């Protein structure tokens, strides 16, 4: 409950909405780059989720927002078998057509989690201890 200027205090962590464009990968290093460390945010409970959509609404709902979640994929996609039952032995996607790193949906009201590409340009929010 004791936190930095340009930041905000909730339970278990300091929070700050970072008003810059960056990739998912680069935003992780910019989260660790804040002196008190940490990563992108993490959402588990209802009151916690309801809390965070209100902080980005103070930044006037600019666009979609990165968060810490990411699909950990073996290869490219996330399905074992085709419809005829045969196994996925071949992949022909593009890294722009990959949706691994998730994002706060700006439409639904920053209440949900949507995967997109990781090299895209969005705002982020680091989650840092006191």
């Amino acid at each position: 409950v004791d936190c930095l200027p340009g930041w905000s205090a909730y339970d278990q962590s300091c929070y700050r909405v970072f008003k810059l464009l960056k990739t998912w990968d680069d935003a992780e290093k910019f989260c660790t780059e804040r002196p008190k460390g940490g990563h992108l945010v993490s959402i588990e409970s209802a009151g916690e989720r309801d809390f965070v959509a209100q902080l980005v609404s103070e930044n006037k709902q600019t666009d979609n927002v990165w968060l810490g979640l990411k699909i950990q994929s073996k290869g490219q996609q996330c399905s074992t078998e085709w419809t005829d039952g045969s196994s996925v032995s071949y992949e022909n996607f593009s890294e722009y057509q990959s949706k691994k790193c998730f994002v706060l949906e700006k439409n639904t009201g920053f209440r949900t989690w949507l995967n997109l590409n990781c090299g895209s340009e969005y705002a982020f929010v680091c989650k840092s201890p006191p």
Binding site: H39, S42, K70, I71, C78, W82, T83, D84, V88, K127
Partner: peptide, 25 residues
């Protein structure tokens, strides 16, 4: 013949914490 190509993978947080409840879009 493919479908739901981003669901069956594990998805880990940046913090490394697990996912107890889900709030997907």
């Amino acid at each position: 013949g493919l479908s739901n190509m981003w669901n069956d993978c594990k998805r880990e947080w940046s913090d490394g914490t697990k996912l107890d409840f889900k709030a997907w879009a």
